[PDB]
Amino acid sequence: SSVSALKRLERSQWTDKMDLRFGFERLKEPGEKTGWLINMHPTEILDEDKRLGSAVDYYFIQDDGSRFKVALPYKPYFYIATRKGCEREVSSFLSKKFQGKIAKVETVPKEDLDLPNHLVGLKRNYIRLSFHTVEDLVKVRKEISPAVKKNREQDDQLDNIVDMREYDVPYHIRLSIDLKIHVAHWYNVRYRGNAFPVEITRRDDLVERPDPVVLAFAIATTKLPLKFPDAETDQIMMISYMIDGQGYLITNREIVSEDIEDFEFTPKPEYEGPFCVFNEPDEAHLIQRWFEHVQETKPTIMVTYNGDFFDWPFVEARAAVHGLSMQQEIGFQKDSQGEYKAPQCIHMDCLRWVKRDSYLPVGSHNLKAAAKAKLGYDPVELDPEDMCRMATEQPQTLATYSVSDAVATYYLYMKYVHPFIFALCTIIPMEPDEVLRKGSGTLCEALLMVQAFHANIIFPNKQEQEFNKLTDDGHVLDSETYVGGHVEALESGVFRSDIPCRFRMNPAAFDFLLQRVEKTLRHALEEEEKVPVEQVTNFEEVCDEIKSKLASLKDVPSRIECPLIYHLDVGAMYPNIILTNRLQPSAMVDEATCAACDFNKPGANCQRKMAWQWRGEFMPASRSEYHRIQHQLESEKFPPLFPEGPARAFHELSREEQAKYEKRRLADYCRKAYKKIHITKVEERLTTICQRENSFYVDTVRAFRDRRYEFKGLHKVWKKKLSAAVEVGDAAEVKRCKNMEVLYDSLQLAHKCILNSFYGYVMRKGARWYSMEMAGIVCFTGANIITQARELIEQIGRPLELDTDGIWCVLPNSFPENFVFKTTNVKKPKVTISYPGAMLNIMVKEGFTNDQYQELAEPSSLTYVTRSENSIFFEVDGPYLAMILPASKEEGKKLKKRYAVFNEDGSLAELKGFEVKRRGELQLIKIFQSSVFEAFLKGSTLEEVYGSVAKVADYWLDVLYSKAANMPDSELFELISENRSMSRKLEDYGEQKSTSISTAKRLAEFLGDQMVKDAGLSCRYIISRKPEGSPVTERAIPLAIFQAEPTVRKHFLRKWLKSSSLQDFDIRAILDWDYYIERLGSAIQKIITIPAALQQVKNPVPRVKHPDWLHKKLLEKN
DNA sequence: TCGAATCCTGGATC
DNA sequence: TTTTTATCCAGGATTCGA
Ligand SMILES: Nc1ncnc2c1ncn2[C@H]1CC[C@@H](COP(=O)(O)OP(=O)(O)OP(=O)(O)O)O1
Ligand code: SF4
Ligand SMILES: [Ca+2]
């Protein structure tokens, strides 16, 4: 014990002296102060009995820049349940048995949503146990739970206790939940000495955030040519940073051959970036100066791009070589999870945001690309191997490179990252860096814990994972799942609003539409717009125009017209599907509970039934065959946990080992004994949703939905006010307005992020509120909605592309489009409607609306009032100028999820899926695909368009047939090389073979394991001819070899090309040109020529032949 | 000996 | 002690049937 006690006191006193050094004095004096809460960390402190107890530190920062700490003592606890009447006997036994370790025990009636017949108002007694310290809590937990495990498996006093709950919420989460303390608010803190607990009370009238000191830093180092750096070998060359918009540079005058003057680097007036420079004689003085300047300026946020991977481990390892210690000078230390942390300031890494919340493609995750897109300028680059000569040859262009990435890290953090995390913390009980690092499911669970606590619900336990469960007909399941979203790719080629197109249409559909126009217009005005139809005067003229247009269409259905291209999209579909049906993870019920519920009377209306599709995958072996395989394990012997350990018996396997050994036997036996390894069985089920259950989940979803639109509105209002303030030109008003704009923008994004999170959480393994039914019923109802939206549109027009929530289509030029009504409302003198929207919203209204919605009108009365609700509405984007869809090289298929679209202005609207955006992909194909889509805008008819794109492909085929005749050799390498990336370490692929693995081994052979050592490797290779007939995986040759020393390059090529006397090693001699020609060929086909053959034009490029199935079909049709 | 189907991985679209 | 799902493309290799 005493070792633990003194360890805890030692670390507490060290941390308290460290944060005292940075100025976070503890609040000492009787009095009241106010401050913005910025951080919290758990700590233990002595009580009036001189006994340790658990506490939490709160860190406050004041308006004037002063800072203070406060410690709040609080006792952790958990709940247990007992059989009839046992609570007095059990609590007395508990208190005598664990005497001195458990502080208090008490009986509490809790409302648990799983109690049979609970809707009448019953609830059950849980005993609470509360402890002096979490150290003592864990021991009693471990003494208790072995009896609960046996009691649960069946279902003295200790035998009687039947369950335990809430035993695994973290201590600071529990404290933030229970006392409602949240970060980025303003508080009053009232202190009275040890005589009484310190009191913290929020005040909502202070709105301006303070401005914490932010430091952003980057480092540059030496390394050996053509190899990765390592901290035992390589010195640091320079370190550069910004603090609150002033920049500094430190330079090592060993390597760098001259002093560097001070200078300004300013990408745009938005980013001033002044820098001031210190020249130091040694690495040790360079590293001394940085720690001195941090201890001087005492930052509260430290930021660096991907610093946890390289920069921090490097500057730590280089400090140890000079007898300094980062953990004593600064205070940062590497946690068990391999991430740096400190008590006194927060380490925020932009790349955890870029990777989670930006919706950039992985190709754009490179720092300079992210800056290019988000900040709209190009930084400068140096080739990583020229830096070491540049340092001697021309120092200041290296300094100019080194600055650019500090500047870009600082302004990227300030603009995008900073408002988002400090907005998102205002609604979630977590630390800022936890909120950044944690997954969105964990962010979404704590919120429901907060909402369940105040409703006095008791948290359910985490979900138990089943292993190798049986199908209900006795077959072991490898999986369970639900069928997801629906996709179709109906048509291919080029659609342009500039060229005629042929339509054929059902006149009874136009008649059906014309017969109901007024319903659709009324419903679109009253229910969506919320303008009563009596307030509009010109209504009948608009209906006369719409009817006469439909009548004109109904006479002549088959026609040639220019197209109109429309996208129709459901807004926030899945939340609205939840809100409309009252789906809740607890609300799904079986026959057995309804049979017990007193409301289950004839004429009750509470049972709503909905359908979903289950899809198991199961093995062919029978139950008895599996059980005989298990019996064959009853006598088996197994290897030890480690080579020194004794051989294990079957009960000494873990349940995961037993499961995997049963999988190994059962799969192998099935493989031999049966023809195919598994069988699928898609199956239809129906599930009841109790309409009267407690509404806390759906009310949370609704509240977030409403707040998002409120903050969007205020954001647009304040942005307009910002434009007005900018025209006024007064800096104080502009600054105030900008602050309000950023506040509402960040709140709006936070609320969108949480709204989007609610769908994903309910399927997470281990989730407290988990169900599979609700997630399947949502996807199925969305698929029914989009199927009926396809069925309707196929008769009015032609759908082109259909996906999870929306449809692309063409409509005939004479279709109604948009109409403007005139209204007497003073705020709303005009209203504009689009007929394609109202046409579908009236279809959704009739089928989907829910007639059973109930709410409890008077909690004491047991009276519920029936309602109705329907929240699902379509909206209309566009129209667009042009739309180009590709086609498949196989006969019976078309490509889904790929297309391009252009705006009316000819600017690129969308370009989805194509290689032009993907990471690690062949540049020649990227440039081709880029140039063709811009070429489709040219020309004036299909035969002009297909004639005019062909000249872009014949340029590149002239290149590949010329072997780059004029092209200077430095261009060719980047044009031709791939750049694929390998996720796992080289061992972990095991037996698997691939071009990346095969070129990783080729790197190990060439440079040693000093390069394979870490994951996330990237491989650049060419593919080579000379090993004739050998499969392609063997011919990958690393690009690096073309920069090696001649005697190394020749030796290794002669080893790899198996060509002993080979005279020429020129890349033009080695390239397998006919591989690349057929890579280009299969892309030019799929874009230009197969779709052309689908639009009654001949092959527009002679050099590339059709596939034989198309050659037959064309020859026979001719 | 020759052709088709299944499998695995890295990365995108909703 | 952790951890959001499902549908789809392109490339390369291995096994079974005619
Ligand atoms: N990252 C993700 N994780 C899980 N499901 C996702 C997802 N992204 C999309 N989905 C699924 C679930 C939602 C669905 C997209 O349809 P909505 O209309 O709900 O989303 P949206 O178009 O973004 O909203 P709008 O801009 O119209 O307001 O795709
Ligand atoms: S659906 Fe009706 S009968 Fe069944 S549990 Fe709910 S309230 Fe009771
Ligand atoms: Ca949508």
Numbering used by the authors: 27 to 181, 213 to 1175
Reported in the publication:
During chromosome replication, the nascent leading strand is synthesized by DNA polymerase epsilon (Pol ε), which associates with the sliding clamp processivity factor proliferating cell nuclear antigen (PCNA) to form a processive holoenzyme. For high-fidelity DNA synthesis, Pol ε relies on nucleotide selectivity and its proofreading ability to detect and excise a misincorporated nucleotide. For proofreading and mismatch excision, the 3′ end of the nascent strand must be partially melted from the template strand and guided toward the Pol ε exonuclease domain active site (exo site), which is located almost 40 Å away from the pol site. Our atomic model of human Pol ε cat closely resembles the crystal structure of the S. cerevisiae homolog, with an identical domain organization in the ‘right-hand’-shaped B-family DNA Pol fold consisting of an N-terminal domain (NTD) and the Palm, Exonuclease (Exo), Finger and Thumb domains.
